[PDB]
């Protein structure tokens with residue numbers, strides 16, 4: 473009853489969810505699907521209760537009647553006076569990142585180059601950059617803009633999946649879950665780091681989290697921030713320290729969604745779960761930490777300080793905001809469970 477079924481996307485999230493389930497005494501239980509879209513369907517059917525989603529997917533889920541419950545809140549400079557759960561959510565910066573050594577590559581010469589994207593339909597990895605490119609181009613032919621890409625979730629035989637690598641064994645190429653090597657913020661930044669693509673569309677935090685010894689992962693151990701540049705919309709290149717003046721847009725934080733008839737119960741349980749496994753929780757370091765997964769951002773982003781209450785009980789449109797909703801609608805003109 474007072475029990476919540478979480479939806480995990482792919483086998484690595486399933487394994488983390490199982491740990492959470494065991495440690496929560498079954499107050500939380502786990503359903504698994506191969507894609508975020510299938511998880512959303514499980515939630516609509518009432519077979520799962522909730523999962524945490526990028527804004528691009530909140531748009532999808534929202535049209536189907538799901539609602540934002542709590543949002544990821546990361547640590548912050550300003551607003552210091554308030555407690556994390558009650559503090560405003562600032563948003564993250566979507567950026568386009570390249571290697572400094574790839575000189576003369578700018579926003580204006582991106583045509584025909586190779587790209588790395590978090591997943592189709594996600595905010596920084598897809599909706600923002602492709603929305604911008606469609607506008608500037610006057611063509612819905614976004615699948616012919618880059619020569620090759622890894623954009624998990626697109627046709628595996630198309631050039632949008634040509635750079636994706638699949639898992640250990642080459643299986644699951646381009647699936648939009650963490651089995652795909654280049655999936656997600658981390659995967660797309662790795663796609664750039666290994667020089668598979670020329671540009672990665674990720675968020676500001678990703679670059680900092682995987683450079684200068686922050687990550688210890690073999691592929692990122694030796695990465696230095698100075699070897700990277702951000703592409704600015706004015707045709708200029710800047711160091712990654714200048715993200716506030718060189719981003720594509722500001723994105724709404726990832727958030728937990730659920731069926732509206734279950735929102736109150738999901739909120740209640742999660743607030744308690746984070747008191748136990750959260751950043752300064754009774755058991756976090758010692759037994760289980762909800763917001764850690766070795767840089768893999770499983771279930772939640774690793775840089776999450778807490779899940780925060782929303783305030784103004786926003787609808788999904790209010791939560792995403794007018795600027796972003798219009799961007800998506802316009803991009804969606806280019807290309808149930810089709811709820812609206």
Ligand SMILES: *[C@@H]1O[C@H](CO)[C@@H](O[C@@H]2O[C@H](CO)[C@@H](O[C@@H]3O[C@H](CO)[C@@H](O[C@H]4O[C@H](CO)[C@@H](O[C@H]5O[C@H](CO)[C@@H](O[C@H]6O[C@H](CO)[C@@H](O)[C@H](O)[C@@H]6O)[C@H](O)[C@@H]5O)[C@H](O)[C@@H]4O)[C@H](O)[C@@H]3O)[C@H](O)[C@H]2NC(C)=O)[C@H](O)[C@H]1NC(C)=O
Nearest residue numbers: 547548549565676677678680681684685686714715716775
């Ligand atoms: C773009 O995104 C970046 C990445 O998030 C934003 O940078 C963060 O901004 C916030 C607020 O502006 C900074 O606030 C700090 O929060 C820190 C915790 O992350 C606190 O700093 C302590 O702990 C850090 C993490 O453990 C640690 O990292 C930083 O410092 C050293 C050297 O400078 C390096 O890493 C060390 O820590 C790791 C932990 O695993 C460890 O493995 C290493 O051996 C080091 O010990 C790293 O390079 C980084 O610079 C600090 O050492 C420090 O001990 C601090 O209390 C403060 O509240 C936050 O630190 C920034 N994050 C990082 C990682 O740099 C940036 O603001 C965004 N830009 C825009 C425009 O939005």
Ligand SMILES: *[C@@H]1O[C@H](CO)[C@@H](O[C@@H]2O[C@H](CO)[C@@H](O[C@@H]3O[C@H](CO)[C@@H](O)[C@H](O)[C@@H]3O)[C@H](O)[C@H]2NC(C)=O)[C@H](O)[C@H]1NC(C)=O
Nearest residue numbers: 599600601602603604606607794795796798799800801802
């Ligand atoms: C790609 O271009 C399209 C087409 O212009 C962009 O959509 C347009 O964006 C602006 C800014 O959000 C919208 O104007 C705003 O709308 C409200 C009411 O219309 C107004 O009060 C605001 O102050 C502002 O003027 C505009 O409506 C919208 N146009 C259409 C036809 O929907 C889109 O945002 C661009 N994509 C990206 C990623 O930049």
Ligand SMILES: CC(=O)N[C@@H]1[C@@H](O)[C@@H](O)[C@@H](CO)O[C@@H]1O
Nearest residue numbers: 560561723724725783784791792
């Ligand atoms: C004041 C207020 O409600 N601000 C909200 C903020 O909390 C966050 O939900 C954001 C989502 O992108 O939308 C608004 O800015």
Ligand SMILES: *[C@@H]1O[C@H](CO)[C@@H](O)[C@H](O)[C@H]1NC(C)=O
Nearest residue numbers: 474495496497499744745748
């Ligand atoms: C399980 O849920 C009940 C009801 O809130 C609570 O008393 C208990 O603390 C929960 N246990 C854990 C470990 O989450």
Ligand SMILES: [Fe+3]
Nearest residue numbers: 526527595596
């Ligand atoms: Fe995102």
Ligand SMILES: [Zn+2]
Nearest residue numbers: 719720721722
């Ligand atoms: Zn801006």
Ligand SMILES: [Zn+2]
Nearest residue numbers: 785786787790
């Ligand atoms: Zn409202």
